[PDB]
Amino acid sequence: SFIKSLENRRTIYALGRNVQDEEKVIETIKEAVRFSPTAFNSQTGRLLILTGDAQDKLWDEIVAPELKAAMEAAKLDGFKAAFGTILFFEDQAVVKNLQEQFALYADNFPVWSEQGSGIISVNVWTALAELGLGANLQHYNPLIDEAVAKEWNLPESWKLRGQLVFGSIEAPAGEKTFMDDADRFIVAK
Amino acid sequence: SFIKSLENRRTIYALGRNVQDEEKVIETIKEAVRFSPTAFNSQTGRLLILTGDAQDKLWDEIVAPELKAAMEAAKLDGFKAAFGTILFFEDQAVVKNLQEQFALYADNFPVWSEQGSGIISVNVWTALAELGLGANLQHYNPLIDEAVAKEWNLPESWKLRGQLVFGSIEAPAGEKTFMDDADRFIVAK
Numbered sequence: 608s609f610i611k612s613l614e615n616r617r618t619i620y621a622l623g624r625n626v627q628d629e630e631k632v633i634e635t636i637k638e639a640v641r642f643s644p645t646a647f648n649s650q651t652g653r654l655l656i657l658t659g660d661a662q663d664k665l666w667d668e669i670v671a672p673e674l675k676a677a678m679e680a681a682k683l684d685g686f687k688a689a690f691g692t693i694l695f696f697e698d699q700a701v702v703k704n705l706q707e708q709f710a711l712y713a714d715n716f717p718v719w720s721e722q723g724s725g726i727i728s729v730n731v732w733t734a735l736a737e738l739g740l741g742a743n744l745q746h747y748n749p750l751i752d753e754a755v756a757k758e759w760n761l762p763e764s765w766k767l768r769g770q771l772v773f774g775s776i777e778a779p780a781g782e783k784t785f786m787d788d789a790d791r792f793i794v795a796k
Numbered sequence: 797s798f799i800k801s802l803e804n805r806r807t808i809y810a811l812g813r814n815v816q817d818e819e820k821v822i823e824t825i826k827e828a829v830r831f832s833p834t835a836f837n838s839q840t841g842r843l844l845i846l847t848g849d850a851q852d853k854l855w856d857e858i859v860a861p862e863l864k865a866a867m868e869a870a871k872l873d874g875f876k877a878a879f880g881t882i883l884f885f886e887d888q889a890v891v892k893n894l895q896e897q898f899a900l901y902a903d904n905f906p907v908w909s910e911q912g913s914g915i916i917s918v919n920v921w922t923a924l925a926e927l928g929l930g931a932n933l934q935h936y937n938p939l940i941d942e943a944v945a946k947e948w949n950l951p952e953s954w955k956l957r958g959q960l961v962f963g964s965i966e967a968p969a970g971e972k973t974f975m976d977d978a979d980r981f982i983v984a985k
């Protein structure tokens with residue numbers, strides 16, 4: 608069931624590279640984004656999908672130095688050890704064009720774009736889990752933005768929002784609690 | 797499959813009240829939100845689920861007058877005709893507390909909350925579609941916020957983000973196009 612698929616998606620930090628069919632994984636990532644809704648069917652999400660040498664490079668040559676340099680003013684090995692990383696962006700050129708075309712909803716489009724990033728991120732995350740792969744979602748933006756844009760020659764208008772690290776599950780998810788229903792759902796007739 | 801479930805979710809404007817098991821619908825809405833991820837497991841989403849008389853009241857006694865009064869400074873019948881409306885909020889008290897506890901990520905929590913609203917909205921939307929029900933997502937916030945808060949005695953800290961109108965499917969979804977893969981997915985090895 609769909610609810611079972613949602614329940615099956617979890618944050619998995621212990622990731623490896625025991626991935627059998629990388630083509631199928633890419634196809635599934637694309638499909639999850641394709642079938643996600645966005646305001647005005649604006650489809651503002653953009654993805655950079657890194658595996659292999661590019662995966663090593665992101666973590667060793669971009670994230671680590673950026674962090675070290677920032678601090679001066681480990682967990683990273685765990686991210687690098689994964690099969691890959693999906694970097695999620697939102698295309699600001701499209702958001703800007705929507706603000707111009709429909710000045711009525713100018714303030715809304717940035718909000719709806721942010722919601723859209725959440726939407727495609729979890730749809731991909733859940734689709735990967737259905738393949739038996741684990742993932743975790745990181746946020747080393749805005750620190751790594753410029754280096755990522757330069758290395759993979761990305762448009763300036765792509766605004767980095769999240770990095771979904773994914774791979775084979777090497778240890779189970781931890782415990783998770785849930786709020787009291789009564790504190791977040793009200794039903795009225 | 798999960799991808800099939802995503803593809804099955806569509807915007808349906810022609811909605812009715814031919815809903816067989818309202819308890820099951822409510823259970824499914826709750827489960828979809830429960831199993832959605834949020835930053836720090838903060839679970840900031842809040843829902844007001846309106847059916848029956850409350851559904852009529854929202855559209856006839858709140859949305860319509862607020863709109864008419866705003867304009868002075870139809871489609872609504874189509875929304876009213878649905879079985880119900882799920883109003884999605886984000887609890888600002890929790891966001892504020894997170895900003896205080898982890899001042900390091902103060903700027904992030906509002907963003908992650910917005911993403912979370914997108915996340916739970918589409919998970920519920922898709923779960924409803926799996927039950928054979930249709931829905932559409934509206935945004936009459938912030939115009940109706942105060943009236944909604946007063947009528948259903950909601951906490952001030954609940955910030956209205958979206959209204960998912962749902963019910964039986966009375967006409968099929970319209971045509972939808974998709975961007976070129978090449979313009980939104982980059983794969984690197």
Ligand SMILES: Cc1cc2nc3c(=O)[nH]c(=O)nc-3n(C[C@H](O)[C@H](O)[C@H](O)COP(=O)(O)O)c2cc1C
Nearest residue numbers: 616617618744745746780833834835836837908911
């Ligand atoms: C919008 C968003 C931002 C998140 N940020 C991070 C993060 O930066 N680093 C991290 O390790 N997990 C992050 N998480 C993961 C959440 O902590 C996790 O989803 C939550 O604790 C529920 O656990 P689960 O994913 O196993 O269901 C984020 C999740 C969401 C939805």
Ligand SMILES: Cc1cc2nc3c(=O)[nH]c(=O)nc-3n(C[C@H](O)[C@H](O)[C@H](O)COP(=O)(O)O)c2cc1C
Nearest residue numbers: 644645646647648719722805806807933934935969
């Ligand atoms: C964040 C968000 C905001 C949306 N805002 C509205 C809206 O205010 N009114 C409306 O009728 N549809 C709205 N939509 C519906 C989109 O236009 C619709 O999802 C998109 O055109 C794709 O069509 P589909 O839902 O049939 O897949 C919104 C969708 C999303 C994800």
Ligand SMILES: Oc1ccc(Nc2cc(Cl)c(O)c(Cl)c2)cc1
Nearest residue numbers: 645646647648719934935936937
């Ligand atoms: O209260 C509102 C009523 C109608 C709209 N118009 C609208 C219509 C569509 Cl199809 C959208 O995807 C979006 Cl984001 C907005 C926006 C706000």
Ligand SMILES: Oc1ccc(Nc2cc(Cl)c(O)c(Cl)c2)cc1
Nearest residue numbers: 745746747748834835836837908
């Ligand atoms: O670059 C970053 C690395 C680690 C964090 N910490 C963090 C850790 C968890 Cl479990 C979260 O749910 C969130 Cl939202 C943030 C935040 C940003």
